[PDB]
C-alpha cells in the first residue's frame, strides 16, 4: 500500500503570499496525485487533479506541482475563506491511499476579546445544574487565560473551554469558557466572576455578575 | 444539480449493524462508480470500497472485505453501504463519492462529487436529545452598539446537533462541543445591535436529528 | 548424439 | 507448536536418533541447557540418552540417541522448534573451493592429484548385515568418480578446481541426514575460520527432510553455491532431499540422445523442483580401480557434479558472483527444447524444465518459477516465488480444468510473490512466476480495479521512465454473484495490460537505467496450443492470454504459451542497453 505522508504545518515563502505544503509517496505515483479543500461539516472539494491541473471553477490562486514522489500544493494570496484542512491522494495504486490533512492557519492584526458573562437559566437551575457561561468572541492571536472567580475566590475544577477554529471571515478565534456546578454549589455563593487575559492589554477584561442585584 | 445525498447520523449497539445510504442525482446513475470512504478525527480518509450501478460489481480494500458490502439500487437511485460486527474501531464518518472519469487510462478520472458525510456512533450509551438553555444578559449600563445572546445545548447524545438563530438570520459563533461526563455540551453566540433585542425577540433553533428533535428557545 | 566417452564434455561445450 | 517430523518412505528411516531444531535465536549455551535438560529428565523416567552432537553455527539445536518413547517429553521442552527423526540418504583465474560430501577417494589417482584435499571429517553409518567386510575394497568408487567428472585432468569440467573431500556415505554408499548435516556445519565453521568462492556438490537423496531443506537454506543465504542430484527414482523431487530446497541448484540426468536418463526399473527424477538438467549417462570419470583407470558411469550424481563444475568455472572468472546470478547464467547458457519429454508422466512435463547445463562461450537474465499445485478447495491458493535477490516481474497461472479466478502479484513478507487462486468447482491451480535479475532496477506493482465504464480502461506504466514488464488479472465477481461471459478490455496501445473488464490488473512498473520493453502477439482461431516468442536478444519478461476457453498461460524459457481446450499469446520481452 502506497504511504502518504503530508507536512504537517503551511510553509510561508515570499513575505507570507505563498503558502505551500508537500506530499511525499511511499513509491512513484507518476503524476496521480488530487487534492482536496475540507471546511469542516462539508464535503472535500476537489483543487488539483494530475499532479497540476486545476479543476472546474477552482481559483488560480491554487496550484499544484510534482511527480514521482514529492508533491506540492500552494495557495498564493490566502485569504480567510480559505481556512479549512488540505489533503492529499494518489490514485496510481489500489487500495487508494490519503494524506492526513493539514489545517491552514493565518497571520493576523491582534485584536482584543469581547467578553460577556450569562447567569444559569431558571430552567438548567430546575433541573438541578447551573452552567455559568462566558464568550470570549473575535480575538487574535489564539493564546488566552480565562480565570473563573467565584465570591473573588479563584475556581479551577468544573470550567470547560472550547476554542472555535480560525474565522473564515476574519481570520480571528472565539473561545467559550463554562462553569457548571450542581444547583446546590450554585445557590452558596452570589458573584460569578470571569476575568480574560490576552496580549492585547497588560489589565484583564473582567466581567462579573451578582445574583442579589436585580 | 450534480449531487450524493447520504443518510442521517447512526448510534449502533457493538456487535450490531448499519446500512448507510446515498441518493444519487442529476446524472445517469448506472453510469458512474460510487465510492466510501472512512474518516476518523486524526488520521487521513480510508478507502473502503467501490461498486458500478448498472452491473451491481464490487471492488474492496482487502482491510474492509469481512466489514462492508456494497449494494445498488437503479429504481431508488441509490447507493448502499452495510458495515457488519461494528466496535468503537468503526466510530467514523462516513464519505460517499463519484468517480468521472475524463480518458481511456485508469488514472484520467477524479473524485468530482461528494456527499456531506454520516456521522456513525459505534456506543452501548443511549440517545438522549438535549436540553436547551437561553443565555441572555440582565441589569446593566448598555455600552456599545451591540448585545450578545447565547444559547447552552447540554446533556444530548451522539455528536449530531445543529443550532440556527431566529431561522436562518447577523453574527454567529457555534463552539465545539465537550463531553461532560458521557454527554455532549456545547453553547452557540449571537451578536444583535442595542437596538432590536429586547425590542424584536431572538430565538435558538436547537435541531439533534439522532433523537429526531428540534427545540425553539425564545430569549426574553 | 551417440554415446561415446568425452560425449558429456562435448555436449555442455568443453570440447570440440 | 513442538511439531515431529519422520520419513515418508518407511524403509529410510532411522529410529533411535533425533535432530532436535530449536528456535531461531537460541545460543549455544541454550541448546546445551537443553541437551543436558533432555538427559536428565531421561535418567528420572529411568531411560539412557546420549547427544551425540550440538549443532551451532548452522543451524541451533542437538543430536540425540534415545526411545522414541522419550519423544512426547522432548516436545515439551524449552526453546523446541521442532524434531526430526533420522533417516538414510543415498549416493546417486580465482581458486574455487569445491566442496564434496560423499563416499572416501582416491586422492593420489592422477586424474585427480594435487587439486584434492582430504578434509579428516568422517560420518558415516555401519555397513547392513553381521559379516559385511569392505575387504580388497578401499570405498572410493563413487566419490573419486565424481571428483574426477568435477576436476579430473583428463575428464573433468573443470580442471583449475581445488576440491575438499568430506567422508558422509559408506562402503554401500548410505549416509544419514544427520551426518550430512554436521557436514554442513563443518562447512560452515570452516567459512567462518576462513576467506574465497563456495561450491558444496551433494550428489546424494533422501526422502523429504525438513532439516536438510533448513541447514541447506541457511549455508545458501551465507553466499555458498550448493548444487544437488534430483534422484534417480524416476519420481518428483519435490518427495526428496536436499533435491526439493529452492536455494540448492538441482540437476536431472540426461543421455547423449537428449532424453532422460533409465537407470534400469527407474531413472532421472523430474518435476518443479529440478532446476536444469546435465549429461548423466555414460559419463567417463576417474576409477578407483588405479592411478590412471577410467570408467563410465550414470546417475544424477554425475550430472550435479557436470554442474558443480561449470559453478566453478564460472566463479573462477567472476568471483564475486552471487548464487541468484549463477543460477541465472546456469539457466541462461543451458540448451533450451533439447530434451524430449515423451519420458515424463503427462502432468509432469510441464513443471520439468527442458534444459540441459553448458559453459558459457549489463544484462536482463529471467527464469520460470512453477508453484505446487493449490488444493481442490474454491478458496485455494498456488504461491510461486522468487529468490531474494531477484524481481518478480510477471506472474500468471494455469488449470488443467481451466476453472481459473486468476492471478496476483502480492506483497508477502515485504516481498512480491506471485499467487494464484482456485474457481468454484476447480480441480486447482498453478502459480507461475518470472524471476529476474535487472541491474538498476526500481520496481513496483500498481493495482488497477475492475473496469465497467465506457472509458478509464487502460492499465499501463503511466511514470516517465517506468516500463511494463508484466500483467496479471484477477476475477472481482464473487462465487455466489450472477456469471456473466467476460467482457475485454478495449485496446488501444500495445504496451497495455489485456484483462476481462470485471477483473483488477496488476501492473509491473520497473524503472532502469538501458530498460526497454515490447509486446508481441499471435493468434490462431482453432489451435491445443498457441505460442509467441522474443527475438534473440530478447527476454521474455510477461506472459498472458487474450481470451474459461484457455487453461493458462506460462513462460517457457523466451517462449509465451497459452493452452486452450482467436486464441491469442500475449507476449512483453524486454532488455537492458
Ligand atoms: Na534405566
Ligand atoms: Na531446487
Same mark, same amino acid.
Given at each position: ?214 | ?18 446500512? $448507510? ?48 458490502? $456494497? ?80 444559547? $447552552? ?29 458521557? $454527554? ?37 | 548424439?551417440?554415446?561415446?566417452? %568425452? ?5 555442455? %561445450?568443453?570440447?570440440? | ?130 559379516? @559385511? ?210 519420458? @515424463? ?19 536482463? @537474465? ?212
Amino acid at each position: 500500500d502506497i504511504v502518504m505522508t503530508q507536512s504537517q504545518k503551511f510553509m510561508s515563502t515570499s513575505g507570507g503570499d505563498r503558502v505551500s505544503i508537500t506530499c511525499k509517496t511511499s513509491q512513484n505515483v507518476g503524476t496521480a496525485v488530487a487534492w482536496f479543500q475540507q471546511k469542516p461539516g462539508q464535503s472535500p472539494k476537489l483543487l488539483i487533479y494530475s499532479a497540476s491541473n486545476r479543476y472546474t471553477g477552482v481559483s488560480d490562486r491554487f496550484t499544484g506541482s510534482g511527480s514521482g514522489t514529492e508533491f506540492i500544493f500552494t495557495i498564493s494570496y490566502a485569504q480567510s475563506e480559505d481556512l479549512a484542512d488540505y489533503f492529499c491522494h494518489q490514485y496510481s495504486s489500489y487500495p487508494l491511499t490519503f494524506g492526513a490533512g493539514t489545517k491552514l492557519e493565518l497571520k493576523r492584526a491582534d485584536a482584543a476579546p469581547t467578553v460577556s458573562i450569562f447567569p444559569p437559566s431558571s430552567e438548567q437551575l430546575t433541573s438541578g445544574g447551573a452552567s455559568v457561561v462566558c464568550f470570549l468572541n473575535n480575538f487574535y492571536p489564539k493564546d488566552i487565560n480565562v480565570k473563573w472567580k467565584i465570591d473573588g475566590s479563584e475556581r479551577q475544577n468544573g470550567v470547560l473551554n472550547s476554542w472555535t477554529d480560525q474565522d473564515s471571515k476574519d481570520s480571528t478565534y472565539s473561545m467559550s469558557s463554562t462553569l457548571t456546578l450542581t444547583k446546590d454549589e450554585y445557590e452558596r455563593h452570589n458573584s460569578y466572576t470571569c476575568e480574560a487575559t490576552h496580549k492585547t492589554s497588560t489589565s484583564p477584561i473582567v466581567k462579573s455578575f451578582n445574583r442579589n442585584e436585580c | 444539480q450534480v449531487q450524493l445525498k447520504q443518510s442521517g447520523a447512526e448510534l449502533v449497539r457493538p456487535g450490531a449493524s448499519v446500512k $448507510l445510504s446515498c441518493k444519487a442525482s442529476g446524472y445517469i446513475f448506472t453510469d458512474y462508480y460510487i465510492n466510501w470512504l472512512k474518516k476518523r478525527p486524526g488520521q487521513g480518509l480510508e478507502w473502503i470500497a467501490r461498486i458500478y450501478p448498472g452491473s451491481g460489481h464490487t471492488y474492496y480494500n482487502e482491510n474492509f472485505k469481512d466489514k462492508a458490502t $456494497l449494494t445498488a439500487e437503479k429504481s431508488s437511485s441509490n447507493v448502499y453501504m452495510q458495515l457488519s460486527s461494528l466496535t468503537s474501531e468503526d466510530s467514523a464518518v462516513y464519505f460517499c463519492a463519484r468517480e468521472n472519469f475524463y480518458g481511456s487510462s485508469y488514472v484520467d478520472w477524479y473524485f468530482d462529487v461528494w456527499g456531506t458525510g454520516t456521522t456513525v456512533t459505534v456506543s452501548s450509551a443511549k440517545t438522549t436529545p438535549p436540553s436547551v438553555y437561553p443565555l441572555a444578559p440582565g441589569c446593566g449600563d448598555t455600552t456599545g452598539s451591540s448585545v450578545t445572546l447565547g444559547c $447552552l445545548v447540554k446533556g444530548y447524545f451522539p455528536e449530531s446537533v445543529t443550532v440556527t438563530w431566529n431561522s436562518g438570520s447577523s453574527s454567529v459563533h457555534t463552539f465545539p462541543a465537550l463531553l461532560q461526563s458521557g $454527554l455532549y455540551t456545547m453553547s452557540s453566540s449571537v451578536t444583535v445591535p442595542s437596538s432590536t433585542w429586547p425590542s424584536q425577540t431572538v430565538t435558538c433553533s436547537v435541531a439533534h436529528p439522532a433523537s429526531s428533535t428540534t427545540v425553539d428557545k425564545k430569549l426574553e | 548424439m551417440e554415446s561415446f566417452p %568425452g560425449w558429456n564434455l562435448v555436449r555442455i %561445450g568443453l570440447l570440440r | 507448536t513442538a511439531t515431529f517430523h519422520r520419513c515418508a518412505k518407511d524403509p529410510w528411516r532411522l529410529p533411535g536418533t533425533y535432530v532436535v531444531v530449536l528456535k531461531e535465536e537460541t545460543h549455544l549455551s541454550q541448546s546445551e541447557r537443553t541437551a543436558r535438560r533432555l538427559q536428565a529428565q531421561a535418567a528420572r523416567r529411568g531411560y539412557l540418552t546420549k547427544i551425540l552432537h550440538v549443532f551451532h553455527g548452522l543451524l541451533p539445536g542437538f543430536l540425540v540417541k534415545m526411545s522414541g518413547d522419550l519423544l512426547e517429553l522432548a516436545l515439551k521442552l524449552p526453546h523446541v522448534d521442532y524434531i526430526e527423526e533420522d533417516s538414510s540418504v543415498f549416493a546417486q583465474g580465482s581458486l574455487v573451493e569445491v566442496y564434496l560430501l560423499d563416499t572416501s577417494i582416491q586422492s593420489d589417482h592422477r586424474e585427480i592429484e594435487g587439486r584434492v584435499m582430504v578434509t579428516d571429517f568422517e560420518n558415516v553409518p555401519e555397513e547392513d548385515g553381521t559379516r @559385511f567386510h569392505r575387504q580388497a575394497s578401499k570405498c572410493d568408487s563413487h566419490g573419486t568418480h565424481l571428483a574426477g567428472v568435477v576436476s579430473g585432468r583428463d575428464a573433468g569440467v573443470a580442471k583449475g578446481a581445488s576440491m575438499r573431500s568430506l567422508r558422509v556415505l559408506n562402503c554401500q554408499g548410505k549416509g544419514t541426514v544427520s551426518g550430512t548435516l554436521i557436514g554442513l556445519e563443518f562447512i560452515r565453521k570452516s567459512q567462518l575460520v576462513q576467506p574465497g568462492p563456495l561450491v558444496v556438490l551433494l550428489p546424494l537423496a533422501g526422502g523429504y527432510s525438513r532439516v536438510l531443506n533448513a541447514a541447506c537454506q541457511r549455508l545458501a543465504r551465507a553466499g555458498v553455491v550448493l548444487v544437488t542430484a534430483a534422484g534417480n527414482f524416476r519420481d518428483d523431487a519435490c518427495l526428496y532431499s536436499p533435491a526439493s530446497a529452492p536455494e540448492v541448484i538441482t540437476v536431472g540426468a540426461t543421455n547423449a540422445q537428449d532424453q532422460p536418463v533409465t537407470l534400469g526399473t527407474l531413472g532421472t527424477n523430474f518435476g518443479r523442483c529440478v532446476d536444469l538438467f546435465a549429461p548423466g549417462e555414460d559419463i567417463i570419470g576417474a576409477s578407483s580401480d588405479c592411478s590412471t583407470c577410467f570408467v563410465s558411469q550414470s546417475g544424477t550424481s554425475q550430472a550435479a557434479a557436470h554442474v558443480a563444475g561449470i559453478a566453478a568455472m564460472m566463479l573462477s572468472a567472476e568471483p564475486e558472483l552471487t548464487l541468484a546470478e549463477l543460477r541465472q547464467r546456469l539457466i541462461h547458457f543451458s540448451a533450451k527444447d533439447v530434451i524430449n519429454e515423451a519420458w @515424463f508422466p503427462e502432468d509432469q512435463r510441464v513443471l520439468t524444465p527442458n534444459l540441459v547445463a553448458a559453459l558459457p562461450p549489463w544484462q536482463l @537474465f529471467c527464469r520460470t518459477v512453477w508453484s505446487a499445485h493449490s488444493g481442490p478447495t474454491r478458496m485455494a491458493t498456488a504461491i510461486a516465488r522468487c529468490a531474494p535477490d531477484e524481481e518478480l516481474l510477471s506472474c500468471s497461472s494455469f488449470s488443467r480444468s481451466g476453472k481459473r479466478r486468476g492471478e496476483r502479484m502480492e506483497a508477502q513478507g515485504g516481498k512480491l510473490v506471485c499467487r494464484a487462486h482456485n474457481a468454484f468447482g476447480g480441480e486447482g491451480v498453478y502459480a507461475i512466476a518470472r524471476c529476474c535479475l535487472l541491474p538498476q532496477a526500481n520496481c513496483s506493482v500498481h493495482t488497477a480495479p475492475p473496469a465497467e465504464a465506457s472509458m478509464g480502461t487502460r492499465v499501463h506504466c503511466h511514470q516517465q521512465g517506468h516500463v511494463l514488464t508484466g500483467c496479471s488479472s484477477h476475477w472481482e465477481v464473487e462465487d455466489l454473484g450472477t456469471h456473466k461471459p467476460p467482457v475485454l478490455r478495449p485496446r488501444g496501445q500495445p504496451n497495455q495490460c489485456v484483462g476481462h473488464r470485471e477483473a483488477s490488473i496488476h501492473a509491473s512498473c520497473c524503472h532502469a537505467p538501458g530498460l526497454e520493453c515490447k509486446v508481441k502477439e499471435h493468434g490462431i482461431p482453432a489451435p491445443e496450443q498457441v505460442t509467441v516468442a522474443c527475438e534473440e536478444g530478447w527476454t521474455l519478461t510477461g506472459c498472458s492470454a487474450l481470451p474459461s476457453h484457455v487453461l493458462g498461460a506460462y513462460a517457457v524459457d523466451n517462449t509465451c504459451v497459452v493452452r486452450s481446450r482467436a486464441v491469442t499469446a500475449v507476449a512483453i520481452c524486454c532488455r537492458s542497453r
